Amino acid sequence: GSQILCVGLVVLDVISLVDKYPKEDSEIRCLSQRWQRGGNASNSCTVLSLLGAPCAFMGSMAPGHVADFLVADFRRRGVDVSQVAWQSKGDTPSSCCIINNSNGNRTIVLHDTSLPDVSATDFEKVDLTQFKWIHIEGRNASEQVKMLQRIDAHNTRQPPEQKIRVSVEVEKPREELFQLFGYGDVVFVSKDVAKHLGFQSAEEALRGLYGRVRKGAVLVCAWAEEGADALGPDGKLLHSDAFPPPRVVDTLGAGDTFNASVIFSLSQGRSVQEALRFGCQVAGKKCGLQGFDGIV
């Protein structure tokens, strides 16, 4: 296997750049506008391609002009779109993103079209042999657990040399998703999910949630500008300071940059410490740039 598969969402980000965030009932005029392809699994694909990794995307899309824009962007990047689960019923999701130029803060108003999510049936149809690593963005937990069990089954039949590495992301504080803790060799838990569970630091979260992971898995938690932490089976907490840019201009997709960079580094055989550090390095570079161009 050579490719890195990212299973999750693709969203059209209808971005506006403002000098100051608007006050409810106001009329600000934006600096600039752009269409950017978004969604967590989608943004991680952009980053992996830029990092020089052969990657593929798996997500639901509806035939139409929004899909044509997204597909052309995926293709322009060299993202393998051959795994896309095309839906006959529904529309492709989009969102209004407000990026504050004075601090880089991103405010998203998402429109979730109720496009059916990728099923365990869609996933059974995939020939796993081309993949080196499979990353799943937590969405439809019950259906994704069946996908994770399929990869587990594949791997039991494989020599250690050709075992598919698996990562999982729990970004939304949804009780259903917490069963995914659970599966995978690398588990990414968000600051928002951690705070929701009552943890006030990435060290508190990793010590509190490590009991929920599979034997020998690595639990990772990025805490924005405070840097990121990781905890493996050795019980040794690992840390990396952030690499903040002198001027933070766009934080939209920073966490996705972190996830893809950590996945990349580990796929390349680097240590968890090296990977934590690289993840923050790339996430920080991206924060001082508009979009993903120039992160390398």
Ligand X SMILES: C[C@H]1[C@H](O)CN1c1nc(N2C[C@@H](O)[C@@H](O)C2)cc(C(F)(F)F)c1C#N
Query: Which residues in this chain contact ligand X in the complex, by CB under 6 A?
Result: 25, 222-225, 227-228, 242-245, 248, 251, 254-255, 258, 280, 283-284, 287
Cβ–Cβ < 8 Å for 279, 230: no
- Between residues 73 and 171, which has the closer beta carbon with respect to ligand X? 171
* Residue 217 to residue 166: CA distance in whole angstroms: 10
Partner whose footprint covers residue 22, from ligand X, a second copy, none (CB < 5 to 8 Å by kind): a second copy
Partner whose footprint covers residue 111, from a second copy, ligand X, none (CB < 5 to 8 Å by kind): a second copy
* Residue 58 to residue 141: CA distance in whole angstroms: 16
* Strand 106-111 relative to strand 94-100, pairing: antiparallel
Which residues have C-beta within 8 Å of that of residue 256, sequence separation ≥ 6?
40, 43, 44, 47
202 marked as binding residue:
no
207 marked as binding residue:
no
Contact flag: residue 91 with a second copy (CB under 8 A): yes
Nearest distance, CB of residue 77 and a second copy, angstroms: 17
Number of residues engaging a second copy in binding (CB under 8 A)? 36
- Between residues 113 and 201, which has the closer beta carbon with respect to ligand X? 201
Cβ–Cβ < 8 Å for 41, 9: yes
- Between residues 86 and 268, which has the closer beta carbon with respect to a second copy? 86
Cβ–Cβ < 8 Å for 256, 47: yes
Residues annotated within a binding site for ATP: 106, 224-227, 253-256
